[PDB]
From a paper:
Here, we show that [name] [name] is an outer membrane, TonB-dependent transporter that is conserved in many Proteobacteria and which mediates acquisition of both reduced and oxidised ionic copper via an unprecedented CxxxM-HxM metal binding site. The CxxxM-HxM configuration, which coordinates the copper in a tetrahedral manner, is highly unusual and has, to our knowledge, not been observed before in copper homeostasis proteins.
While OprCWT and most single alanine mutants can be (partly) loaded via Cu(II) incubation, this is not the case for the C143A mutant. We hypothesised that removal of the cysteine could lead to much lower affinity for Cu(II), so that after SEC, nothing remains bound. To provide support for this, we determined the crystal structures of the [name] C143A mutant cocrystallised with Cu(II) or silver Ag(I). For each crystal, datasets were collected at 8,800 eV and 9,175 eV to distinguish between both metals. For C143A cocrystallised with Cu(II), no anomalous peaks are visible at both energies, showing that Cu(II) binding is indeed abolished. All 4 residues in the [name] binding site contribute to copper binding, but not to the same extent and, in some cases, not equally for both copper redox states. This is illustrated by Cys143, which is essential for high-affinity Cu(II) binding but dispensable for Cu(I).
Author numbering: 66 to 723
Write the structure that this text describes.
């Protein structure tokens, strides 16, 4: 019954990590989707500024991760990923966060090489008329203030539920004393009304908006706007027949509208290679749907379904004159669409409960993806001068089958699950893998033409030991990527020119962790995370792989309250690939190891209020992580200074529940 601050999260079941993102988290997370994953072993984040970092699972970056918000998928708009999907997520507003590791699900959408991440709000249910309400405030160093509110009323046959949050923090300072350009401010409000005419039927309509700004020490422009608007429509039925137990259909609509610029949160760099006032606006309209049936008879849980999605990128940029010096903002100019993706697919996943102690799971899905290039012309060929785009209105498509099988066995003597699984996923290229790179494979025409789908074939295995005093778990993976999409960086005349290529990679790695109850109120727990990758085409290492990392926790509990400390130690990373990486990160230098210590405590003052506090980086260590971006230079950043992590940090949080 003793309340605690989360420092790490175990596998609850094979390949599956399920956590509730409203409980306090030790390295206190900026109010975005990424940082709520730092506690999950296996996840590193690329630091861009103070918030809105880009998650990386087992070294795999970007769209190899399937990030969903109530089954619907929010997509960014920026050509350099300043609005990564998790920019628009505030995990504190959802009731559950689930992670599935490796390519071991077909239910939630296509091409999930690395894993699947699910934030969901769960349906309210009401006896008679009643109302619940949760709220929490968090105050901390450097102007950190996060309010958050959920509230729902309803009765037997309906409900309406409001969730909202507002968070903001000022520039953090490192362990060395300097102020890091890393300001931010965010909010979200979502409403949901739901109808339940009888206990076997549910419909819910959802609407929400959100906005945010964020200063970026690593990127050459800041985020002036992260406007999001959503509309959702769920429908479920239970116990249709006696072998058809659930039918769910849902339609989502997510619109992102984002302005990056260099004069609202920063003044334009004088020397630079861009001293103009400059802004660029980008939107992404997304419409998608899912439709699934669960059948159960005998020892068989079969889920069949089809899905579809369409999304639409548009852009427009500022134009600044250099003799009248009258700047015309972008929103006084027409929208110039340039990409439309589509996806339709169908899927099934069968689960066989053969015997008490053995389970057999297998999924397949067939996807029909396609994109059309509406860029009538391109910024290439000179000072970036216009040049007729050879793929103008060209359309690419492909049919792509994924699938997996996984066997889980429970030993008879000990409380042990052993599991092994083989999965193969194919992924149609990203918006960013197709339109962002300034050139495509050697002797291509552009990137949109020649960039192949990436097909990943991975073996997953591990165990769970969940007995009385000891709980342990371990997952490993070995896999091969064929046609890994990979960016190389040159510089000539104007800036770091990207070039996307298609290479084969070998990847292995694992994660394990354990938690031991020494006494009735003393607890300890450690976790370990290693990722490894090799570029087989060039016999190079893979770029942008997080180094080996270990966490150790120790906890004292007393029913009413708890305290804990936390040692995080990370090794250097001596496998690099200079000037290669992804659309976010170049790899440059070998990283330095480090360790960071942290203190936390929690107190249950009553049934409704519950307090929590912590100190992050107690010994004010000045460190940087391998995957962080480089600092701007127009921010006083040396040759290739990565962006420093935050120094000593104090935070306190109160959690209400009437």
């Amino acid at each position: 019954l003793a309340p605690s601050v989360v420092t790490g999260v175990a596998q609850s079941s094979p390949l599956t990590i399920v956590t509730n993102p409203k409980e306090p988290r030790q390295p206190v997370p900026a109010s975005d989707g990424a940082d709520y994953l730092k506690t999950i072993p296996g996840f590193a984040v690329i630091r861009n500024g103070g918030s809105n970092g880009d998650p990386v699972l087992r070294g795999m970056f970007g769209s190899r991760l399937n990030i969903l918000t109530n089954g619907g998928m929010m997509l960014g708009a920026a050509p350099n990923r300043m609005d990564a999907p998790t920019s628009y997520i505030s995990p504190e507003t959802y009731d559950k966060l689930t992670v599935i590791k490796g390519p071991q699900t077909v239910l939630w959408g296509p091409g999930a090489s690395a894993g699947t991440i699910l934030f969901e709000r769960e349906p309210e249910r009401f006896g008679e008329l009643g109302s619940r309400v949760n709220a929490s405030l968090l105050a901390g160093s450097n102007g950190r203030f996060d309010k958050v509110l959920d509230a729902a009323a309803g009765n037997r046959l309906g409900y309406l539920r409001f969730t909202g949050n507002h968070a903001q923090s000022d520039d953090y300072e490192d362990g060395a004393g300097n102020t890091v350009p890393s300001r931010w401010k965010k909010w979200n409000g979502d409403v949901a009304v739901g109808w339940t005419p009888d206990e076997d039927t549910l419909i819910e309509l959802t609407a929400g908006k959100g906005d945010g700004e964020a200063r970026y020490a690593g990127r050459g422009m800041d985020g002036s706007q992260f406007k999001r608007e959503s509309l959702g429509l769920r429908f479920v039925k239970s116990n249709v027949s006696d072998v058809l137990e659930k039918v769910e259909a849902q339609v989502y609509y997510n619109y992102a509208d984002h302005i990056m610029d260099n004069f609202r949160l920063r003044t334009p760099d004088p020397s630079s290679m861009m001293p103009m006032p400059m802004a660029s606006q980008v939107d992404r309209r997304t419409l998608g749907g899912r439709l699934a049936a669960t059948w159960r008879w005998d020892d068989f849980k079969l889920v069949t379904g089809v899905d579809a999605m369409r999304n639409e990128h548009r852009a427009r940029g500022s134009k600044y004159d250099m003799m009248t010096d009258y700047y015309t903002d972008a929103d006084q100019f027409p929208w110039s669409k340039d990409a439309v993706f589509h996806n339709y697919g169908a899927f099934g996943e069968l689960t066989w409960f053969a015997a008490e102690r053995d389970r057999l799971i297998g999924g397949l899905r067939l996807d029909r993806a396609s994109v059309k290039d509406y860029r009538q012309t391109l910024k290439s060929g000179h000072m970036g001068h216009a040049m007729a785009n050879p793929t103008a209105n060209d359309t690419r498509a492909d049919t792509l089958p994924s699938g997996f099988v996984r066997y889980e066995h429970d030993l008879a003597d000990s409380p042990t699950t052993l599991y092994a699984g083989l999965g193969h996923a194919e992924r149609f290229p990203d918006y960013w893998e197709l339109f962002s790179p300034k050139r495509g494979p050697n002797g291509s025409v552009n990137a949109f033409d020649k960039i192949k789908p990436e097909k990943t074939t991975q073996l997953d295995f591990g165990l769970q030991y969940n007995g009385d005093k000891l709980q342990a778990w371990a997952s490993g993976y070995v896999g091969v990527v064929q046609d890994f999409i990979l960016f190389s960086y040159r510089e000539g005349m104007m800036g770091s020119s990207t070039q996307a290529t298609n290479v084969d990679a070998r990847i292995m790695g694992g994660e394990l962790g354990a938690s031991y109850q020494l006494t009735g109120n003393w607890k300890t727990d450690a976790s370990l995370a290693y990722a490894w990758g090799k570029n087989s085409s060039d016999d190079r290492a893979l770029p942008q792989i997080p180094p080996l990392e270990a966490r150790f926790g120790l906890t004292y509990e007393e029913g009413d309250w708890s305290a804990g400390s936390l040692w995080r130690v990370v090794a250097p990373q001596n496998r690099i690939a200079r000037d290669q990486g992804n659309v976010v990160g170049k790899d440059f230098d070998k990283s330095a190891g480090f360790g960071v210590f942290s203190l936390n405590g929690a107190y249950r003052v009553t049934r409704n209020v519950k307090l929590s506090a912590g100190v992050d980086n107690l010994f004010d260590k000045d460190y940087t992580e391998h995957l962080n971006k480089a600092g701007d230079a127009g921010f006083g950043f040396s040759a290739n200074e990565t962006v420093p992590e935050p120094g000593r940090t104090f935070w306190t949080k109160v959690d209400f529940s009437f």
